Amino acid sequence: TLKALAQSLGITLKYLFSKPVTVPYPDAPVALKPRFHGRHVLTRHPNGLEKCIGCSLCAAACPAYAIYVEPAENDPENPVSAGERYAKVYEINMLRCIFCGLCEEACPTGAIVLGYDFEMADYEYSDLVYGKEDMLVDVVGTKPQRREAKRTGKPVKVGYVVPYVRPELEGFKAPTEGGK
Amino acid sequence: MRLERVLEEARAKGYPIEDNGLGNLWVVLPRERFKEEMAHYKAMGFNFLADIVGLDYLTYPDPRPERFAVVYELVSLPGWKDGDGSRFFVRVYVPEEDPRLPTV
Amino acid sequence: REGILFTTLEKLVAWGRSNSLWPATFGLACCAIEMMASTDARNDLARFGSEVFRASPRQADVMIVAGRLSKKMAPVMRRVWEQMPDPKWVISMGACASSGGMFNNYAIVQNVDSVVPVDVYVPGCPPRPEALIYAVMQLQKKVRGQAYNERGERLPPVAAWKRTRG
Amino acid sequence: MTLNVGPQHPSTHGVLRLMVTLSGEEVLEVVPHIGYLHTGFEKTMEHRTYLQNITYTPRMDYLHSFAHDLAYALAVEKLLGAVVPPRAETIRVILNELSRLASHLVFLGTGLLDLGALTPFFYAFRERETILDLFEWVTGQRFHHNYIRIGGVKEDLPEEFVPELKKLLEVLPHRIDEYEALFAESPIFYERARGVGVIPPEVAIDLGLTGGSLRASGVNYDVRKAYPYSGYETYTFDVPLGERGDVFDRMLVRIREMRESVKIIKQALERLEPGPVRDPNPQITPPPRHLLETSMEAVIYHFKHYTEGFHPPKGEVYVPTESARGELGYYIVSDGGSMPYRVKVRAPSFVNLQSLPYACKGEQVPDMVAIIASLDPVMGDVDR
Amino acid sequence: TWSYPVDPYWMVALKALLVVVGLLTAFAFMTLIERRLLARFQVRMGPNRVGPFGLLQPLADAIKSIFKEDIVVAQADRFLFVLAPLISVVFALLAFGLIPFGPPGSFFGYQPWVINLDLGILYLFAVSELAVYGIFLSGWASGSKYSLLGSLRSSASLISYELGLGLALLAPVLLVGSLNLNDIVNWQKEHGWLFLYAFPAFLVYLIASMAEAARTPFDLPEAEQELVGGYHTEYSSIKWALFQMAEYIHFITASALIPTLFLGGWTMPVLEVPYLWMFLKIAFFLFFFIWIRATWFRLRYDQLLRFGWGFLFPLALLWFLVTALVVALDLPRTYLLYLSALSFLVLLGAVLY
Ligand code: SF4
Ligand code: SF4
């Protein structure tokens, strides 16, 4: 009955004058937690040496089969990774990546570490099979972001923050409450 | 427990009685006698027919009597004013040649 | 006859078109539940020309193909697409749609782009709402013609001249 | 006439093609026509590993994801006889109940949306976000999760988890009430709901309805009580019940559930302390990765686990469980391969839908929309 | 008028022209406030980009509407299709120039209306039939019996309510002894604002004007996020915009009349501020409905039909009759005052338990 109808209005009215709680994107960075799963990064050692060996353990883990990995045996004089095997081609089709995370768990080099990326979307199928060098810990954005930032000449931002890094990542420093 | 008067009966009628150590039980019946048997059960106070899982044993690494096998799960809802929690399966091997079986 | 072919008109009209985007979501998946999320309650879309969020092509021309689908849905979707007005854009939302995630099966349709042409992919199942925002920002500047591909290659300001429009 | 309400409409988003035999001002019967989506998960998963199958489990329940997952987990766990740490089990209930709340949030959110006043949805959603934020924290995933792992979850809780969890338990009681506040009075609420949603308890079982439909008709039937599975034995909580099949009844039940759920949370927090988070039998469990560094045997098992994945023994198995959506269970035949030889899923909502032409006998035409909505369709059950 | 101004054909025209486009711009920015006020109401940020405050978004919207296919579909006839929105907008536009905006000869000394007639009430009442004409016509035009059936509901219901509005307008004509607005206003100028005089008629009127198309019984089927109105969803572009537009124009028209009626529009013995006082009354009721609109539900027309017809209309004419008794014997109008006030007081007391 009738009382309620009034009470209904009451509360909502409180809320009306309440200054809201919503966060504008991309105008205050999204709040993420360190375990969050963005775009995979390929890590390296302080020895400047890529951790991955083309472990390809992930590939058994990927139910989508989202990984095309051509292996190779490192240079003995100039090894691109200290190991005797590396990933001569590292491709990931993001169009079906499962971002298994199990992925990470199987990889023993800890090469693969989910990012904080999500700013990925483009118009063309085959551009969205992200490559090796797009999948590093050394890039400064997403593929479209970056590609924009050259033609526009603008710099970068990514619009997220975490409380702090995930320990797993230990290279790249992201915006963390202190960046955007 | 509602189950038990079915069990002695099943035994009486010599039906093989499968049991997993996980306490799941099947009763292996022929097609013909099923309907009526199952009629008797509902009458005996079987509340709830939960499932019908159709099984294809096309390829299996052990022999089975038939390729197609149905399995009913009957239950007695104890939370109802009747019932005992009496839950059990009935399996009924099925000729591939005739993919028939009277409904329930 | 659509607002083009003088300097003035095309920028004008294009601003109009770009900023008024009216999403018609084509839920059939988890996407939808994130989509209602995507609407409100953290972020808005009304500041991107959207009060339209609902089921009439009689209200919209922004097609968001949102979710993993089956064979049975292809002609349906096709027809729904057809029953939109002449300029119209195709977002392919999420992985589930875009290339069929983790299913390889008869039942499903993989590579939704089969059924209708696409202009925008936005991967991830689930993605973040915000990614979709980023996507429509893309789509904004895309229909504005201030876009390319990752090879610097230009493209039309519509989804709708990749296969037949109607 | 036979009216054809097609898929994706209006914002009810079942694939629904519905043949409504009308009197031109009434509903007589609906022949529902469905199955316009489907995958055949059950098939696919025999072509993936057991580990892999855990991907599939939350991918057919938008709502309480974790329940499917759990139910499947349990089945496996039983089969090879694996045990789960107490702390693990603590966590598992917490997530489960958190997921139940989520479900309810979405249920009522949609309820409002579907028809009736639109707005309060957004508030319920605010809370949902809070829940989501909790999920985000611990699993890095908004929803869909894999945190639960065989033998127990795969890593420890955040510390950050504790503050926020308390926080939201503070706010919610009051909030819950205020949603409830909209319903019970509003005499229009009455006039839209009370009369409709009819079905005898007797027929609820005959046509198959599951708790919160069955218990929406106040028939006590918690599968957590009846076939009590882990932890719940030793947790107090009661059954929330209605006493008749109507929309009206349903709606109030859910609110009560939430409060029960919250007390279970409350209970849980007390019973929470350090412990290993999964079974330490490395035969059956993947080993810790902080030890690959160390032994070969580790490396071997590790490698093996994530490649081939174990062989469970031959067996069929079923466990009945109480999901948010009703009677849940997996009938799993494994042949002892690396993949099962049968994955049957018990999908409650699907069975609950059988009772729709019945449920919707002789109803009124604007009412019929709600009557669908009130039952809660998640199309995954149906479509599979 | 028998004591009131006149102005050239040209000046008349100008005022008209202005007032039309004024109401366009009105509708535009109204949408903005509605959107934003909605957001805020449900604790949310809104249009703020492309503004500041989303200002230019309506432009975009309008521009969107144009440059589009705008076609008739087979199984409909062309002429009817075109006419059917047209009609509704003309007649929606029409009827607002009747009503004033301030004190006489004071729109820069020129008359503060566009037409003024001598027969206020009639005109309004008359216009009230013509919108619903547009509606059902559209239904039929569309050639889906689905659309049609909705429209039949709609119209039927509307028309039901339309009648109660009739029974309302007799009552003030009693009091003033006249039906032209100005005098009516002026009646309140001496004695005071008319809802005092007849709270249940204020009340019953109020709730009947709800029953206008206004998205506030808020089922009809209305269109936008329910089973739809048949005057939409078989429409396209600009034509669709028109319908939506119309619903809002009604909304505000009604929102204006209620001030007109129960207050003076700009009577307020405290101060004279013409235009200001108009808006303030507008504003009040405007928000008032919107607050209802938000926080209250979609109402099955089944319920509604039962509701208005059986209870609401009979009680309204009943109140009239009573007042007519008093007025016929021409008794102290104080004698109504007490009662009016009391009935409200009663029916107010009735709320809580
Ligand atoms: S990323 Fe890891 S798992 Fe993948 S190939 Fe490299 S070392 Fe192996
Ligand atoms: S991409 Fe993920 S969230 Fe989207 S429909 Fe597929 S499974 Fe659902």
Give me the CATH number covering residue D57. 1.10.645.10
List of residues 6+ apart from C87 with CB closer than 8 A: C2, C17, C61, C158, C160, C165, E67, E68
- Nearest-by-CA chain A residue for E49: A24
- Nearest-by-CA chain E residue for C49: E57
Side-chain-side CA neighbours of residue D31 (13 Å): 6
- Which chain A residues contact residue C120 at CB under 8 A? 121-123
Note the residue count of chain B: 104
In chain C, the number of structural domains is 1
- Say which DSSP state E49 is in: T
Note the residue count of chain C: 166
Side-chain-side CA neighbours of residue D167 (13 Å): 11
D243 with D218: CB under 8 angstroms?
yes
Q: Which of D57, D143, D89, D81 is nearest to D330 (CA)?
A: D57
Label the pairing between strands C89-93 and C120-122: parallel
Tell me phi and psi for residue B92, to 5 degrees. Answer: -145, 110
Q: Rounded to an integer, what distance in angstroms lies between the CA atom of residue E319 and that of residue E172?
A: 12
Angle at A77 between CA A74 and CA A79, to 5 degrees: 35
D110 with D373: CB under 8 angstroms?
yes
List of residues 6+ apart from C69 with CB closer than 8 A: C28, C29, C77, C97, C108, C109, C112, D37
C30 lines ligand 2 (CB under 6 A): yes
- The C-alpha R_g of chain D, in whole angstroms, comes to 22
Q: Rounded to an integer, what distance in angstroms lies between the CA atom of residue D382 and that of residue E50?
A: 44
Determined by which method? cryo-EM
Label the pairing between strands C69-70 and C108-109: antiparallel
Token output for E109: 């000394």
Q: Which of D254, D318, D282, D277 is nearest to D92 (CA)?
A: D277
Task: Name the amino acid, one letter, at A33.
Answer: K
Token output for A8: 């209904």
Asked if residue C65 is part of any domain, the answer here is: yes
Label the pairing between strands A30-31 and D342-346: unpaired
Task: Name the amino acid, one letter, at E129.
Answer: E
Asked if E291's CB is within 8 angstroms of A9's CB, the reply is yes
C139 with C152: CB under 8 angstroms?
no
Distance of CA A173 to the CA centre of its chain: 12
Is D342 within 8 Å of chain B by CB? yes
- Say which DSSP state C26 is in: E
Is A31 within 8 Å of chain C by CB? no
A 10 A CB-CB count for E105 gives 13
Label the pairing between strands A160-161 and D342-346: unpaired
Q: Rounded to an integer, what distance in angstroms lies between the CA atom of residue D239 and that of residue B79?
A: 11
Q: Rounded to an integer, what distance in angstroms lies between the CA atom of residue D30 and that of residue D28?
A: 7
Distances in Å between the alpha carbon of E118 and those of C49, C105, E94, E97, E246?
45, 77, 17, 13, 27
Task: Name the amino acid, one letter, at D216.
Answer: A
Domain CATH code at residue C28: 3.40.50.12280
A 10 A CB-CB count for C114 gives 10
List of residues 6+ apart from D166 with CB closer than 8 A: D269
End-to-end CA distance of chain C: 16
Angle at which helices E199-210 and E334-349 cross, to 10°: 50
Q: What is the structure's resolution, reported in angstroms to one decimal?
A: 5.5
H or E element that contains A6: helix A2-17
The chains found to touch A (3+ Cβ pairs under 8 angstroms) are C, D, E
Tell me phi and psi for residue E309, to 5 degrees. Answer: -60, -55
Tell me phi and psi for residue D344, to 5 degrees. Answer: -100, 135
List of residues 6+ apart from D127 with CB closer than 8 A: D105, D168, D172, D175
Asked if B80's CB is within 8 angstroms of D219's CB, the reply is yes
Q: Rounded to an integer, what distance in angstroms lies between the CA atom of residue A31 and that of residue D80?
A: 41
- Say which DSSP state D233 is in: G
D70 with D96: CB under 8 angstroms?
yes
Token output for A130: 């992200």
A 10 A CB-CB count for A140 gives 11
Q: Rounded to an integer, what distance in angstroms lies between the CA atom of residue E99 and that of residue E257?
A: 8
3-state helix, strand, coil in chain C (%, to 5): 35, 15, 50
Catalogue the long-range contacts made by E8-17 (C-beta closer than 8 Å, 24 or more residues apart): E11/E110, E12/E114, E15/E97, E15/E110, E15/E114, E16/E97, E16/E114
Q: Which of D224, D197, D235 is nearest to D213 (CA)?
A: D197
* Helix ranges, E191-231 (H): 199-210
Side-chain-side CA neighbours of residue D253 (13 Å): 28
H or E element that contains D111: helix D86-114
E65 with E237: CB under 8 angstroms?
yes
Token output for D100: 């139940």
E303 with D368: CB under 8 angstroms?
no
Residue C164's Cβ-count burial label (10 Å; 0-12, 13-18, 19+) is exposed
Token output for E318: 């009943």
Asked if E46's CB is within 8 angstroms of C85's CB, the reply is no
Angle at E271 between CA E270 and CA E277, to 5 degrees: 110
In chain D, the number of structural domains is 1
Which domains are assigned to chain A? 25-178 (3.30.70.3270)
Buried b (16+ CB within 10 A) or exposed e, E281-296: bbeebbeebbbbbbbb
Catalogue the long-range contacts made by D232-237 (C-beta closer than 8 Å, 24 or more residues apart): D232/D93, D235/D93, D235/D264, D235/D267, D235/D268, D236/D267, D237/D263, D237/D264, D237/D267
Asked if residue C82 is part of any domain, the answer here is: yes
The CA-based dihedral angle spanning residues C46, C51, C54, C57, taken in that order and rounded to the nearest 10 degrees: -110
Q: Rounded to an integer, what distance in angstroms lies between the CA atom of residue C57 and that of residue C85?
A: 7
Q: Rounded to an integer, what distance in angstroms lies between the CA atom of residue E154 and that of residue A58?
A: 61
Q: Rounded to an integer, what distance in angstroms lies between the CA atom of residue D245 and that of residue D58?
A: 29
Task: Name the amino acid, one letter, at E60.
Answer: A
Q: Rounded to an integer, what distance in angstroms lies between the CA atom of residue E14 and that of residue E11?
A: 5
Asked if residue C165 is part of any domain, the answer here is: no
Token output for C80: 């729904």
The structure tokens 């709730």 sit at E207
A52 marked among binding-site residues = yes
Strand partners, D342: D333
**Which domain, by its residues, includes D298?**
1-384
Q: Rounded to an integer, what distance in angstroms lies between the CA atom of residue B76 and that of residue B73?
A: 10
Side-chain-side CA neighbours of residue E252 (13 Å): 22
- Which chain B residues contact residue D221 at CB under 8 A? 77, 79-80
H or E element that contains D331: strand D326-333
E211 with E281: CB under 8 angstroms?
no
H or E element that contains D58: none
Q: Smallest Cβ distance to D205: which of B77, B78, B87?
A: B77
A112 marked among binding-site residues = no
Q: In what order do the strands lie in the sheet with C89-93?
A: C23-26, C62-66, C89-93, C120-122
Q: Rounded to an integer, what distance in angstroms lies between the CA atom of residue E233 and that of residue E223?
A: 8
Q: Rounded to an integer, what distance in angstroms lies between the CA atom of residue D109 and that of residue D107?
A: 5
Q: Which of D137, D108, D136 is nearest to D123 (CA)?
A: D108
**Which domain, by its residues, includes C25?**
1-160
- Nearest-by-CA chain A residue for C130: A25
Token output for D112: 């409002």
Q: Smallest Cβ distance to E57: which of C2, C19, C56?
A: C19
Asked if residue C166 is part of any domain, the answer here is: no
Q: Which of E193, E183, E174, E163 is nearest to E120 (CA)?
A: E183
**Which domain, by its residues, includes E320?**
1-353
Note the residue count of chain E: 353
SS3 A30: strand
A180 with A161: CB under 8 angstroms?
yes
- Which chain C residues contact residue E62 at CB under 8 A? 16
Q: Rounded to an integer, what distance in angstroms lies between the CA atom of residue E30 and that of residue E38?
A: 12
Q: Which of E44, E20, E29 is nearest to E286 (CA)?
A: E29
Distance of CA C16 to the CA centre of its chain: 17
Distance of CA D265 to the CA centre of its chain: 17
Classify A177 in phi/psi space as left (phi over 0), alpha (psi -120 to 50) or beta. left
- Nearest-by-CA chain C residue for E32: C46
The structure tokens 């789960």 sit at D84
In chain E, the number of structural domains is 1
Q: Which of D131, D155, C34, D61 is nearest to A101 (CA)?
A: D155
Closest residue by CA, ligand 1 atom 2: A107
Side-chain-side CA neighbours of residue A71 (13 Å): 12
- Which chain C residues contact residue A93 at CB under 8 A? 99
Q: In what order do the strands lie in the sheet with D321-323?
A: D321-323, D326-333, D342-346
List of residues 6+ apart from C100 with CB closer than 8 A: A96, C68, C108, C109, C110, C111, C112
Q: Rounded to an integer, what distance in angstroms lies between the CA atom of residue A160 and that of residue C97?
A: 26
Buried b (16+ CB within 10 A) or exposed e, C52-90: bbbbbbbbbbbbbbbbbbbebbeebbeebbeebbbbbbb
A41 with A112: CB under 8 angstroms?
yes
Q: Rounded to an integer, what distance in angstroms lies between the CA atom of residue D103 and that of residue B65?
A: 44
Residue A152's Cβ-count burial label (10 Å; 0-12, 13-18, 19+) is exposed
Q: Which of A140, A141, A144 is nearest to A124 (CA)?
A: A144
Chains C and E, touching by 3 or more CB pairs within 8 angstroms: yes
Note the residue count of chain D: 384
Which of D5, D9, D11, D68 should we substitute to test contact with C (largest number of C Cβ atoms within 10 Å)?
D11
- Say which DSSP state C113 is in: G
Q: Rounded to an integer, what distance in angstroms lies between the CA atom of residue E120 and that of residue E183?
A: 10
Residue C19's Cβ-count burial label (10 Å; 0-12, 13-18, 19+) is buried
SS3 C127: coil
Distance of CA D358 to the CA centre of its chain: 25
Is D327 within 8 Å of chain B by CB? yes
Asked if A30's CB is within 8 angstroms of C101's CB, the reply is no
E4 with E116: CB under 8 angstroms?
yes
Task: Name the amino acid, one letter, at D253.
Answer: V
The structure tokens 């003030």 sit at E172
Q: Rounded to an integer, what distance in angstroms lies between the CA atom of residue B7 and that of residue B5?
A: 5
Angle at B58 between CA B52 and CA B64, to 5 degrees: 80
Angle at which helices D161-180 and D247-270 cross, to 10°: 160
Label the pairing between strands C62-66 and C89-93: parallel
Closest residue by CA, ligand 2 atom 8: C30
Q: Rounded to an integer, what distance in angstroms lies between the CA atom of residue D288 and that of residue E118?
A: 92
SS3 B27: strand
Strand partners, E107: E110
Token output for E186: 């002026």
Q: Rounded to an integer, what distance in angstroms lies between the CA atom of residue E297 and that of residue B66?
A: 59
Token output for B101: 């079986």
Give a three-class secondary structure readout of D288-329. CCCCCCCCHHHHHHHHHHHHCCCCCCCECCCCCEEECCEEEE
Strand partners, C92: C65, C121
Q: Rounded to an integer, what distance in angstroms lies between the CA atom of residue D340 and that of residue D316?
A: 10
Residue E350's Cβ-count burial label (10 Å; 0-12, 13-18, 19+) is exposed
Is A158 within 8 Å of chain C by CB? no
- Which chain C residues contact residue E234 at CB under 8 A? 58
